[PDB]
């Protein structure tokens, strides 16, 4: 990447996972943008959380810009899926990690309970109607 190149743009799919082998990159944040928040150096990875996502579900959070001539190692999500095709015991672990990360943000037994509640409400409406008919 050339100097002042937007490695990651804000509001982008960000499917890949970059690692740094030579150079430095900076996360352009701040109040109105164009402000450096943190710079990562050789040996730093970023964007790995997107490798376990689904089609169009990892819109990038901020902007990432290369300070100078940087040397990144991209690993696309499609390649990860192709590799995962041949490894199910790691696929289950990766999906469990994804489910944990998605569960830690929102906050057959359930369906059976819902069906029982619907049946109970239907029976209760009829019981109230029978009580009213006995009264009336």
């Amino acid at each position: 990447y050339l100097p002042n190149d937007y490695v990651c743009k804000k509001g982008e799919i960000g499917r890949e996972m970059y690692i740094i082998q030579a150079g430095q990159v900076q996360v352009l944040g701040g109040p109105d943008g164009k402000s450096v928040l943190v710079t990562l150096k050789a040996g730093s990875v970023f964007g790995e959380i997107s490798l376990l996502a689904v089609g169009g579900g990892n819109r990038r959070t901020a902007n990432v810009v290369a300070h100078g001539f940087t040397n990144l190692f991209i690993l696309d999500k499609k390649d990860l899926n192709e590799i995962l095709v041949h490894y199910p015991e790691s696929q289950k672990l990766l999906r469990k990690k994804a489910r944990r990360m998605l569960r830690n943000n929102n906050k057959g037994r359930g369906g059976r309970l819902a069906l029982l509640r619907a049946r109970l409400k239907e029976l209760a409406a009829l019981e109230a109607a029978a009580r009213q008919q006995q009264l009336l």
Partner: protein
């Protein structure tokens, strides 16, 4: 064979006509192996199995809810009995 199949992927009736006339060619001399070798029933059974599973799950949900309610009532009764016996056990 694979090239023929993948070229026939875009042609739905060409494969049927080809197999029909291949059956005719075989019938010209040594008709296939079994002339009575001649689908929807399999799909119907596949769907009926899913329908039966759904009905069984729907029944089992209500059964489990009723069992949970009965277990809660029995546990409450047992807890009341234990609390009543508690005065004699501790004293």
């Amino acid at each position: 064979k694979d090239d023929l199949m993948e070229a026939l992927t875009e042609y739905p009736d060409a494969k049927g006509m080809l197999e029909e006339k291949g059956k005719q060619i075989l019938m010209k001399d040594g008709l296939l192996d079994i002339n009575i070798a001649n689908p929807k029933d399999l799909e119907e059974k596949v769907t009926r199995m899913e329908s039966s599973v759904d009905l069984l799950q729907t029944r089992f949900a209500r059964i489990l809810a009723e069992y949970e309610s009965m277990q809660q009532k029995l546990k409450q009764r047992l807890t009341k009995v234990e609390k009543f016996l508690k005065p004699l056990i501790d004293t």
